[model samples]
Target: ADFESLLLSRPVLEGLRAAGFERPSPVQLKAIPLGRCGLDLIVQAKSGTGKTCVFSTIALDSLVLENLSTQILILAPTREIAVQIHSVITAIGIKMEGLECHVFIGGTPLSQDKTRLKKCHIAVGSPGRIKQLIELDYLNPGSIRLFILDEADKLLEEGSFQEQINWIYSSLPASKQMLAVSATYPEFLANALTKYMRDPTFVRL
Candidate 1:
């Protein structure tokens, strides 16, 4: 599986197998290569097409466990989706490694989340709570290299999250890579790439 040759350990590969990932799905095969190339990509892949792994492989791709710094920031539209995304992130990448993930959401207690937020190398959360952490200076955008907005169209349209999303993007370093994966594309998304992404490679998977 080229897992170790590609710099991943046997345990991560084993977890993928246990999770039934025999190989990259169509969207992953397309997006993973593009993602690894360091492009600011806006991808259109339906649910269950391996979108999560595509945007996030770079986290494990670069991590050496026992290392610290929240390099990956994932903003899921809802708390349930946030947890699901985090579970996928942990299951696929963090098993044999020292990499740690923190989930920040409104329903949870700030004190409890604070400790996890301290040692995290990746954070997955609902937009509002993520905003709070960012505002509190707990989730440092400068430390972030990968910023993801899952279900982009919905968050940009239905919620009060548009402003928060824009704020988070502006806070991230200019050299950072941003990805917006949307099952339903909206015109506003194109508008977003122009402002936030750097020469983004649009992958229509």
Candidate 2:
């Protein structure tokens, strides 16, 4: 189905077009529906399969355009990916006036994050920096409703970011939607995700 059929908000649908997206990829076709419904999701798709766009568009579609409060939080594994995700979100939110998106990564000064964190409506960052910001009280989680963990398997596998991921998840509102994406799905990933997501819908492409 086309993105228009999903009944996304005006700015969201327009953003997709502005981004030169017309047809949805298989991953997008499957994931957008589940995401729009607010179902916690574990999405598995190969890299470069438009999975990032799927999540970005769905996230934009879920937001209330008029509300300045932060509603979506995305955690990427590295600064580069975090910046890429931030760009995707910014592109999607192009027409969304007053919508602010911030990226917090360890390489940057925490003081910069302190200023950006306050006005941002969507926060995208690396695990370590995000956790540190929350702990230091530079970032607030009170208004967050959707948490996206891109490359979930890597984070959960071998417990690389187990503690920090858990800490960030715990800090967010309990009722928030959890969206986990990975290149491949392992049995352990499903088990680990349950710690934050409740009965999440599994989508593979």
Candidate 3:
């Protein structure tokens, strides 16, 4: 299906066009609509199936461009993947005025993150660093509108990671929308995450 049929805003559509995205991939087609409707989503799709765009488009649509208070929070298992998600969101949100996407990870000083997060619209990071920032009061959980877990399977599989993930999840506002995209979703993992989300939409492509 075409992006227009998905009802993306004008600026996002323009950004997609400039990025040379002419049509939605299967994952995007199925997930984007559900994401835009503000439903919690558990999407199972292989890597490189346009999963990033699905979340990015939904994020851009929900962001309040004038208010820079970290409306979206995305967590990935690794620093490199977090940075990749940040890059894709920034690229796709180029047309959005005053849009700011920040990446927080280990190896960076806490002071640096504290300074950058003050004006952030979207925050992407590894769970450990994100949880630290949340505890330090640098990242305000109340302002987050959309929370995403990229590579949900990997994040849920590890003991330490799942602990941190639970901490971060519990810190966020109950009203925030959630999306979990992964290459695989074992039954146990899916069942575990269901407690954190409302009646989430499930999509496998």
Candidate 4:
């Protein structure tokens, strides 16, 4: 089925077409449907397999345009990936009016993020800075509806990052949708993640 068959809103479909996304990749084909249904997902797909699009489409489709508060939180392991995720989301949601996406990564003071976060509808960033913003009460945890961990395997490997990820996860609302995507999900790490997810669907490609 094409993107149109997925039941995306007209504006979102326009954004996808404008971004030159003609068809859903394999990963997108399998994951987008479940993601849109608000299910917790563990997606295993390599880089360049359209993993970003899968989550971006779901995040964009789930957003409430009238609400300016942050509803989606995406955590990437590195600043570059976080920035790329933000760009992908922006490109896909280009036709969406009143949509605001912000990136919070290191190398910038927390003060800057504090001011910018007020207008954020979707927050994308590296784990450490995002966790800091959450701890400082700059990013409201209660408002988040979708929480995504891009490159989940790497983020879970680092001892400190694992702790930070847990801290951030603990801060989110209890009923938030969770999506974790990675090229490789080690058995141990996948087990660790399931504790937080509720009957998660595993999509391995």
lDDT of each: 0.75, 0.86, 0.89, 0.89
Per-residue CA lDDT of candidate 4, range 1-205, in tens? 7998888888889999999998888788889889888899999988889888899999999999898999999998888999999899999999998799999998888898999998999999988899889989999889998999888888888563788888898988888889988899888677779767968899977
Off by over 4 Å in 4: none
TM-score of each: 0.88, 0.95, 0.96, 0.96
On residues 76-137, what C-alpha lDDT tens digit does candidate 3 reach at each position? Answer: 98989998998888888888888999999999899999999999999999999999999999
Clash pairs for candidate 2: none
For model 1, how does the per-residue alpha-carbon lDDT over 62-140 read when each residue is reduced to its tens digit?
A: 5556658888888988888888887887777745567688778887787777778878988888878888888888676
* Candidate 2, backbone clash total: 0
User: Rank order by lDDT, top first?
Assistant: 4, 3, 2, 1
RMSD, every candidate, angstroms: 2.4, 1.3, 1.1, 1.1
Better of 1 and 4 by lDDT: 4
lDDT of 1: 0.75
Off by over 4 Å in 1: 1-12
**Against the correct fold, how does model 4 do in TM-score?**
0.96
Error of 4 at 117 (Å): 0.7
Model 4: weakest 10-residue lDDT segment is 155-164
